[PDB]
Amino acid sequence: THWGYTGHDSPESWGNLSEEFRLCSTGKNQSPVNITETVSGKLPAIKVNYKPSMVDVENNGHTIQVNYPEGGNTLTVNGRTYTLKQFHFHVPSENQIKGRTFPMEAHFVHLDENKQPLVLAVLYEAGKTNGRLSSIWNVMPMTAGKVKLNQPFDASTLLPKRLKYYRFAGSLTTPPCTEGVSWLVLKTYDHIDQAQAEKFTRAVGSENNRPVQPLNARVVIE
Ligand SMILES: NS(=O)(=O)c1nnc(NC(=O)C2CCCCC2)s1
Numbered sequence: 001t002h003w004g005y006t007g008h009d010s011p012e013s014w015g016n017l018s019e020e021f022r023l024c025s026t027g028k029n030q031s032p033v034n035i036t037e038t039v040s041g042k043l044p045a046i047k048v049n050y051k052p053s054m055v056d057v058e059n060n061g062h063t064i065q066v067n068y069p070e071g072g073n074t075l076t077v078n079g080r081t082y083t084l085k086q087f088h089f090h091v092p093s094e095n096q097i098k099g100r101t102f103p104m105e106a107h108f109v110h111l112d113e114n115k116q117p118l119v120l121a122v123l124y125e126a127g128k129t130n131g132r133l134s135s136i137w138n139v140m141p142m143t144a145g146k147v148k149l150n151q152p153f154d155a156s157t158l159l160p161k162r163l164k165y166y167r168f169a170g171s172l173t174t175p176p177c178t179e180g181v182s183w184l185v186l187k188t189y190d191h192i193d194q195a196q197a198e199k200f201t202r203a204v205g206s207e208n209n210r211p212v213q214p215l216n217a218r219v220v221i222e
């Protein structure tokens with residue numbers, strides 16, 4: 001079932017496109033969000049266990065995605081271990097800090113041993129070229145399709161050494177907009193060239209950010 005971010009199947013509409021997309025419009029704990037007021041708490045430390053792996057790079061029509069066939073890239077938070085499935089990108093940013101939208105956002109999507117989903121978000125401010133992403137941008141499929149990268153890729157290089165985060169509970173930002181997703185949103189920003197962002201957008205064919213959704217009852221810890 002066709003969906004996108006412009007025209008007639010835009011997010012404002014996802015709910016009605018089929019009956020299994022319905023939480024997109026009826027959900028009360030939907031992502032993304034504007035992080036304005038927060039509650040200062042002592043959050044458990046992120047331990048990252050990323051290493052180089054043989055990824056491959058996909059334009060699925062909505063984002064540019066880096067798929068991890070094997071485990072081995074994990075994340076430990078508060079005892080539970082969370083395995084990296086893929087990462088992908090929204091231009092511009094989906095989530096906001098104090099009303100501010102960033103040139104780009106990355107999403108590291110994990111599953112624990114119970115299939116409880118965790119998204120680890122990185123926010124990219126304007127600046128110099130991102131040299132650590134250049135490897136993905138080079139083979140970036142500019143239409144729907146998959147290219148399998150010859151050289152191992154190391155996502156360890158895409159995360160900060162400083163790992164403070166915002167913690168709220170949410171949903172997928174894409175249909176079926178499934179809830180029960182944990183959102184860790186990192187505070188130390190990375191950077192992108194304007195050229196890297198235009199090129200992403202060429203590939204995908206539009207701005208691929210879902211508008212922010214009401215927090216309703218939710219507190220964002222920081
Ligand atoms: N825009 S986003 O909320 O971060 C999203 N992230 N993942 C989304 N779906 C997936 O990853 C599927 C494939 C592999 C792992 C879970 C299910 S949607």
Ligand SMILES: [Zn+2]
Nearest residue numbers: 088090107173
């Ligand atoms: Zn995403």
